[PDB]
């Protein structure tokens, strides 16, 4: 939702994710992307424990 708010597409390649759109994504959007990636990793760890 935050990606399409700025008119950017969220490409889900797997654990890593990429944003495709016009020009470089804002630093806040990249921070959100990295936050989601790290949260997914920590969530997998929490699931297994």
């Amino acid at each position: 939702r935050e990606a399409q708010e700025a008119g950017f597409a969220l490409s889900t390649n797997g654990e890593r994710l990429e944003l495709t759109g016009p020009g470089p994504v804002p630093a806040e959007l990249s921070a959100r992307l990295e936050e989601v990636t790290l949260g997914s990793l920590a969530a997998s760890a929490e699931l297994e424990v």
């Binding site: 630093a27 806040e28 990249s30 921070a31 959100r32 990295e34 936050e35 790290l38 949260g39 920590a42």
Partner: protein, 49 residues
């Protein structure tokens, strides 16, 4: 003994440190820092071109 459980808690706070690295503000700062550094990179590239 109190030192013992305090030390155990501090040791397990490595995950708290990781979550701190997962915070939105820290990630925004890190993305903005890499933003200036990459910006200098393509600035040099544009000067060369």
């Amino acid at each position: 003994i109190h030192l013992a459980e305090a030390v155990e808690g501090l040791l397990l706070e490595v995950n708290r440190l990781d979550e701190l690295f997962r915070q939105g503000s820290f990630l925004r700062e890190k993305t903005q820092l890499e933003a200036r550094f990459k910006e200098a990179r393509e600035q040099q590239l544009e000067a060369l071109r």
